[PDB]
A paper describes a structure:
To test this, we introduced cysteines at sites on the central axis of the D2–D2 dimer interface, cross-linking of which has previously been shown to inhibit channel opening by trapping the receptor in desensitized-like states. Thus we compared S729C, cross-linking of which permits the relaxed dimer conformation, with G724C which we predicted would not accommodate the relaxed dimer conformation when cross-linked. Our functional data demonstrate that cross-linked GluA2(R) S729C/γ-2 receptors retain sensitivity to glutamate, implying that upon agonist binding they can undergo structural change which affects the channel gate. To understand the molecular basis of this, we determined the crystal structure of cross-linked S729C ligand binding cores in apo-like conformations bound to the competitive antagonists NBQX (diffracted to 1.8 Å resolution) or ZK200775 (diffracted to 2.0 Å). AMPAR gating is driven by the separation of the D2-M3 linker regions following agonist binding. Thus, binding of glutamate is known to increase the distance between the α-carbons of Proline 632 pairs at the base of the D2 lobe of the GluA2 LBD. For the cross-linked S729C mutant LBD bound with NBQX (S729CNBQX) the Proline 632 separation was 22.8 Å (similar to that seen with S729CZK, 22.6 Å). This is less than the separation we calculate for the glutamate-bound mutant LBD (S729Cglu, 26.4 Å). The fact that GluA2(R) S729C, co-expressed with auxiliary subunits and trapped in the relaxed dimer conformation by cross-linking, exhibited properties consistent with those of wild-type channels, demonstrates that this conformation does indeed mimic the behavior of the native desensitized receptor in the plasma membrane.
Author numbering:
A (entry chain A): 4 to 262
B (entry chain B): 4 to 261
The structure:
């Protein structure tokens, strides 16, 4: 009764150890969610095997085929018993899977090259000298579109029609575009990923302002899992105990490069 | 067999009906959490008695006595089986009681008298001609103490050492102070209460800006309640079904006045 854990390769949640070819099983991996899985496993009392989600995806309905992909699909279709990953708690996913209480809280945020005279989304909306965009598809792009909040709809008005296109294909593209643009491009992305980059060499980016919305990552189990309650109580206790905060400090700041 | 529901009189969550002296039992009360209690009950299959928390409080641990007051205390000390109320999910409360998934999302927000040239917290930070404050003790002032976001810490720098005192003794004081100052005082309070007041006569306040943090209201049960699981699944399904949004629309906007 070894529990199959599905997860995803995304720094610093799960990463390959430098010498991973020499190692086997769970020892190939390290990261925030590697450590979290061990704590949850400990608290619930199960042995487990970490597996990387086959298709590299978090989980969406292939839009017109009704079939779930990513880690969600691995749970609904019985290929994994638990997902321990930065998986966003959403209502469409709650229709088919269960989430624990959030193990991390995050939201959309602004990344700038340090010295950029921007402090907030309002600041970006009021001005055109500094360009700004988001990933070229995903929740952050989707959030600005369907927002009705005036500051956010003005931002969508600007980004949708800007030329050259202010959207980027990957997080790495957005970040390179911030560092290369002399402080005249700003990037909208998840605060956790933003705080992670601000601790990476060459330490020239910074997160500014408060977050623009409220999301959480939760641990997911298939509906009717016998683990659901035990997992939820583990997260609650790990959160109360400060362990979640200690793991965040370890992988973001202890293992950081800019402190 | 009848479960005791503790809740609090807080408009529009639970309110006395116009003719409450004429009625008995659960029919004396009405509101968002009155209707929610009915849905939770329906979904979980229990009869229930609505009772108003004896001391009118939400729940805190007296530092000197270790004793909980309010609805939290009524759950932990066995006076109630469930709280169905706008009770904030917090880490100190989760140590002693269980919360369902949130049935409502809210945050700190800015209430303005209409016509005040303020649109955001940053705006308030850059200026002093318009004063601004919060309740004189509680989570919102507390959030400003420990903030490290630049705009929010500059605000706290200002508010702590301001004269006359920008803090107020009750929400009625803060709201009356917004209406009394023709737009030269701004009040920081929960987004839900802010949106509620903006739909009530005399329709002179409004919520401005986005929320400053992320909080949630949850249904609470004593630790080890057999209802904990049923309630959580009920809230999830009511949320999925849109009932929580419909109840918000009903008590905030359908029954609004502006
Ligand atoms: O559940 C989800 N969890 C996610 C977790 C992450 C992060 F932890 F930051 F890695 C990200 N990153 C966004 C930045 O580029 C790399 C991936 C995306 C996620 N998405 C897709 P989105 O919400 O459309 O962006 C989900 O759906
Ligand atoms: O659980 C809690 N739920 C609360 C719910 C509300 C309301 F908004 F009415 F629903 C309020 N306020 C009274 C109305 O005007 C401002 C907000 C306070 C609450 N508090 C104390 P706080 O956290 O110090 O603010 C709690 O502890």
């Amino acid at each position: 009764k070894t529990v199959v854990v599905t997860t995803i390769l995304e720094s610093p949640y799960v990463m390959m150890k430098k010498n991973h070819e020499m190692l086997e099983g769970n020892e190939r991996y390290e990261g925030y969610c590697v450590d979290l899985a061990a704590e949850i496993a400990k608290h619930c009392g199960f042995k487990y095997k970490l597996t990387i989600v086959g298709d590299g995806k978090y989980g969406a309905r292939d839009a017109d085929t009704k079939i779930w992909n990513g880690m969600v699909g691995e749970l609904v279709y019985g290929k994994a018993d638990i997902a321990i990953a930065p998986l966003t708690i959403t209502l469409v996913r709650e229709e088919v899977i269960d989430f624990s209480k959030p193990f991390m809280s995050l939201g959309i945020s602004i990344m700038i090259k340090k010295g950029t005279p921007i402090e907030s989304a309002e600041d970006l909306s009021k001005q055109t000298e500094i360009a700004y965009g988001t990933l070229d598809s995903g929740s952050t792009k989707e959030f600005f579109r369907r927002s009705k909040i005036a500051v956010f709809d003005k931002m969508w008005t600007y980004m949708r029609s800007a030329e050259p296109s202010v959207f980027v294909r990957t997080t790495a593209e957005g970040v390179a575009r911030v560092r290369k643009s002399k402080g005249k491009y700003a990037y909208l992305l998840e605060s956790t990923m933003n705080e992670y980059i601000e601790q990476r060499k060459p330490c020239d980016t910074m997160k500014v302002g408060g977050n623009l919305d409220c999301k959480g990552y939760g641990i997911a189990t298939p509906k009717g899992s016998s683990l659901g309650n035990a997992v939820n109580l583990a997260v609650l206790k790990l959160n109360e105990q400060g362990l979640l905060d200690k793991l965040k400090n370890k992988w973001w700041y202890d293992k950081g490069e800019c402190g």
